């Protein structure tokens, strides 16, 4: 593990403190260093015990005039890898590149060293395991490590710009996966012009992302704005005003499935959530709302109220038959049953209903066919993903049908008790038309408001109010196992007085007593002592909880709702048939420009 | 008192008024001073009410020229000390260095004064009387007020700097206690040096502590962190990153018992709780929670919960028998008893609790010799410190472990009235699980903000409440003396009008009233008047109250966190047996070097 890394570095320290001849470059002292050339005992391929050479280890402490000497030992010493496990080999490159002296890197390249070498060790490869990520190239380094007259310089002596990589990197992700982007974004406009004279930038990765996809989907807002603007193409100005006209072929990406605004609002990334505040993509969503998304959303909606209000009303009528015996005890009350099918449908009364219940099943399963070739696509854990998609929205319309369609199955063998079901599906399904208040402007806060709290608060909460009513609970039982029952209700066995201590709890029912007879010694004290414990500070505590974090969520509501807007607009674009769905932007092929889709704005910005 | 230091003071005043000599000192004219010296009457052993010389008033209101004529007189002068109670003696270097003046100085050390006397005076020692703490010598007078130029000047001439004093402060304790840390740290590196040419460090005081410590305990972390550079060692630095190893021989303390992780958390000061977000120090906590603590600590809760359900569910089953004789009269409800032991164990259903029972009292005896030799080792005020710790969950272990043992004793001799300490033992022993909320992220500061709640807001605040719902028992008792009890239950007697007006005050049980019958006339206008100023705001103000305890703890709970989490691994890491428990850090004794332990961090801090 890590205690293996430890183990490494300092065997690969006590080896270097080991021998002489590789010690003196450390120590820097030129008549030792010598009195050591001098003699052919001395060898010039001492190793360590990681793969090393004389060389490295120079170069590493910062001794250029120690390793010129050296240098005219053997021209064999600037190709010669490591050869081991944690470093897999690097060349002198590899690290005099990020030391940045200049001298040293002049004084290789005239030996002759490789100009390029992929170097793939434990400790190069992208991991949280890691601090840094640079690539695989000494041009990576070079670019990466901003020094411009090393990366010139290099250019200068080969290596191509197109060279790919362990996980399919270009240099151009590289610079878009780091941060300091201010000093980064003008070396990359740099770069970007000595392979000028398919491009550079069209080829992806092996996960399939072309760099504009990624510089969207990672979150870096400054370089996202830099690089829009070679797109960008200027119409008249006049006066105070302008107005601008975008190119709108890679942000839209209409052939492809994989589309740019579904990637960017699904990703793990918080400040890739910012990026759509931008102009150029929140005139487009601005747009698409407000002229299309709307209306189907509310027909939608309208649908499926109209659906919901017609299967209460024909569960509300169900057909029931007078008991068969009579109770031959007290503790009992029941006067109907449920009637049989043979009996069942005799009437006109009886006849109109039937349609009903064809069309609640019917429902059912169109409503089942529709969610489940979705999980298929995507994978089960990414279709349950956070809260802007919509998940626990998701998952309770799927329990919803397989309930409503358990029902008919139980119906047709002639099964009793049918009531649990049915009122499992009466209770989910007006609790799920609760995901409509997305496309309202007031309504969408709140629904994500209760959804994280019920989610992230509650549950972290309930142990400590379980462990002190359970407590309570069997403390009041055994106070009252020796009363006649027919005095107190309350407390008789055990599951009632855990069920009435929790209802206790919350100041819903009011505490039991009586005045005609004497209750017990013990009871006062323990009831005055839950009533200062449990009732009064600890609900208050859970309500301060529930304020504080309604305020977090208060503040950032106008940022919070285009997001599920865009959302919703995505998928229902997804979702819904072609022919109702036209193009966006402008087709450019009349107007005299050649096959492309473009977008127009203006500005009142300059005085 | 203080008031004899007023007395003292003045007294002092009023004597160097009185007498011409001494006074020309303060006056500092040199006309008289001339003509009192021509005098052969005028003597110079004249002496103040408090013990003193012409040369002590004369350094101390600041008059050197004054003192350079006195200076001929005799050299006896620099050599008499005081000799009172206040002041048991001091020379006029004591006076003479913390005026700074050079020219002074180098008079007295010319003449010949003592370069080291020892003064203690009641002015002297530490105490939360006096306003200054300094020490007992003048080179402790002339670092710490800052001088440089006089420190090297004393030590010219002797005074060596291994040199107790009482409560054994050395001169190091004395500069890290003080304030004003950015002066005086650069003055300790000065200091050092000269005592180089066992160590200084390592001599402790009285108490028990080295000076490394001893800023630990006292919560200074500027010099701490100045401190730690020392020892600190640099390996490799390439790139950006760099990579460093901590010495670990007294940090950890692995010999001796009073370690100094469990010194700095136990202690009464504030600041040193802030002093472990260091990182020498953070990196090894959180190497050895991460490690070794969870799973031990896991393991232990979930034994102790699978110990009380078997409490529990072998304290629910107890036996009973049919009650003896019938009910003679109304007012009483009771249908069974308790009981006898000969005729208890008849059957293998009441052969199986049995084991249950004997794991329970086993269990409870080895509870019980546990934290009893705890409290022997530090002292009884120390083991009930303060919340970190973990006192109040302490004292309720003992007392459930008490009751559970008295509980054997009363059943075995046939005793009626057995379910008073079953009751407070079954109530206490599921509200004491509560504390295996350690070893979470996010349950701790709850635990510590109800605690907090309990035992800091409540108790100053209940007798407001008690002297209120007092008066409103009386006259709701005195109004209802008069009428049928058969009608309105309630206020009765005292006490059920008491204890029936504290459940009205809390909004739980509803107001009495009947409609069948006719009530008095003043219960009407004192229930209003009771309705408006118990119920409404008096309730309201404490809940506002409990949300401004709730918000002040809750901003740093990341950093109250920590202090916890490193109480329970010390205490932990102690009880437990020694083969479980490994070393920790590198044992630097095969890679060379000898006998030491060793921990290394790296660091991308540079660009
Ligand atoms: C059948 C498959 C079931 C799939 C179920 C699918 C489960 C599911 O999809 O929702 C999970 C839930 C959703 O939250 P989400 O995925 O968006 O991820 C973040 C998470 O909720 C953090 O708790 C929040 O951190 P914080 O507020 O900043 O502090 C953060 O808020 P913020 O960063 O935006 O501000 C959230 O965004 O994430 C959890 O809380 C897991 C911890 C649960 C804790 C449980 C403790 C016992
Ligand atoms: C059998 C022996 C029994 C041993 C019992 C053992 C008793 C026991 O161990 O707890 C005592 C309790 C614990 O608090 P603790 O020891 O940590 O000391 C501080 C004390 O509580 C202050 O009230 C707080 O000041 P403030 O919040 O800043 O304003 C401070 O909070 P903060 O500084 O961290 O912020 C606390 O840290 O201290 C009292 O309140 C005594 C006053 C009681 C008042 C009673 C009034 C009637």
Known sequence: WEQYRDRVNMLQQERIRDSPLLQAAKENDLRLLKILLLNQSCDFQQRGAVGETALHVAALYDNLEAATLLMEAAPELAKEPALCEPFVGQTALHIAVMNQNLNLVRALLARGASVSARATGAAFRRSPHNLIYYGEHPLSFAACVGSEEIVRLLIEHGADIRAQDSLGNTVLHILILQPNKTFACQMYNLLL??????????????????????????????????????????????????????????????????????????????????????????????????????????????????????????????????????????????????????????????????????????????????????????GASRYFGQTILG???????????????????????????????????????????????????????????????????????????????????????????????????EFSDYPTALFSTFELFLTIIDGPANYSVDLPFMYCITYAAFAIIATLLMLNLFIAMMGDTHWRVAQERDELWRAQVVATTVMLERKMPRFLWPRSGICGYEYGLGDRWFLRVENHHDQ
């Open 193 to 378: 012009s000595y392979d000028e004279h398919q491009s550079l930038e069209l080829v992806p990765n092996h996960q399939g992302l072309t760099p504009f996809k990624l510089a969207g989907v990672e979150g870096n807002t400054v370089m996202f704005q830099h690089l829009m603007q070679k797109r960008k193409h200027v119409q008249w100005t006049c006066g105070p005003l302008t107005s601008t006209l975008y190119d709108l072929t890679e942000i839209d990406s209409w052939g492809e499935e994989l589309s740019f605004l579904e990637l960017v609002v699904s990703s793990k990334k918080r400040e890739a959530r910012q990026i759509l505040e931008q102009t150029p993509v929140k005139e487009l969503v601005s747009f698409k709302w407000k002229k299309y998304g709307r209306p189907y959303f509310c027909v939608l909606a309208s649908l499926y109220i109209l659906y919901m209000i017609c299967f209460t009303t024909c569960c509300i009528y169900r057909p029931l038959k007078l008991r068969d015996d009579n109770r031959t005890d007290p503790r009992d009350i029941t006067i109907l049953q449920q009637k049989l099918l043979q009996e069942a449908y005799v009437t006109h009364q009886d006849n109109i209903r039937l349609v009903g219940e064809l069309v609640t099943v019917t429902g059912a399963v169109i409503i089942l066919l529709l969610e489940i070739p979705d999980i298929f696509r995507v």
């Open 391 to 489: 998940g626990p929205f998701h998952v309770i319309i799927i329990t919803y049908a397989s309930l409503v369609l358990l029902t008919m199955v139980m119906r047709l063998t002639n099964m009793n008790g049918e009531v649990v079901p049915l009122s499992f599906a009466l209770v989910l399904g007006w609790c799920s038309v609760m995901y409509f208040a997305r496309g309202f402007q007031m309504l969408g806060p709140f629904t994500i408001m209760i959804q994280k709290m019920i989610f992230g608060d509650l549950m972290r909460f309930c142990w400590l109010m379980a462990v002190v009513i359970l407590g309570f609970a069997s403390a009041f039982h055994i106070t009252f196992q020796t009363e006649d029952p027919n005095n107190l209700g």
